[PDB]
């Protein structure tokens, strides 16, 4: 109805159209800002910050991405699938400006960006304690969003 309400609905449609072609949205700084930082939003965003370029040989990022793929695939096929939760990734070499804004000097990091407000302490996944099995990522997502993604491989 309102100008801001209509823009929001269009923005969500744009993410749903992206969804038909991708399970994970690969973002540079412009897209990150437009779809994750900019208001308004009524959806949660999960983001994997990664550095997957071969020359860097970031083994952790590589393995973590394999799990994140399994997760986002599980989402895609879920009976719980909706327009209220999306998965994105930001690669260091493509979104360097994003890493700097977030004061990230390494990878990988998984974060939840809620529709309102900023990420809370628990909105950074505790990778160093837990590891990055898709099932553990899913547990964390459930805790932060109440969306329960049941992993399959």
């Amino acid at each position: 109805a309102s100008k801001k309400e209509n823009l929001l609905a269009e923005k969500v449609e744009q993410l749903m159209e992206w969804s038909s072609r991708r399970s994970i949205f690969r973002m540079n700084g412009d897209k990150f800002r437009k779809f994750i930082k900019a208001p308004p939003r009524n959806y949660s965003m999960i983001v994997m910050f990664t550095a997957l370029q071969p020359q860097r040989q970031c083994s952790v990022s590589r393995q973590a991405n394999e799990e994140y793929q399994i997760l986002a695939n599980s989402w895609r096929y879920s009976s719980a699938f909706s327009n209220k939760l999306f998965f994105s990734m930001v690669d260091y070499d493509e979104g360097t400006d994003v890493f700097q804004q977030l004061n990230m000097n390494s990878a990988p990091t998984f974060m939840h960006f809620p529709p309102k407000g900023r990420p809370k302490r628990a909105d950074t996944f505790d990778l160093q304690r837990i590891g990055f099995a898709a099932e553990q990522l899913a547990k964390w997502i459930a805790d932060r969003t109440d969306v329960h993604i049941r992993v399959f491989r």
Binding site: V60, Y92, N105, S106
Partner: peptide
Amino acid sequence: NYTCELKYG
């Protein structure tokens, strides 16, 4: 190495 250090893009 065993850590992914990121300096410049």
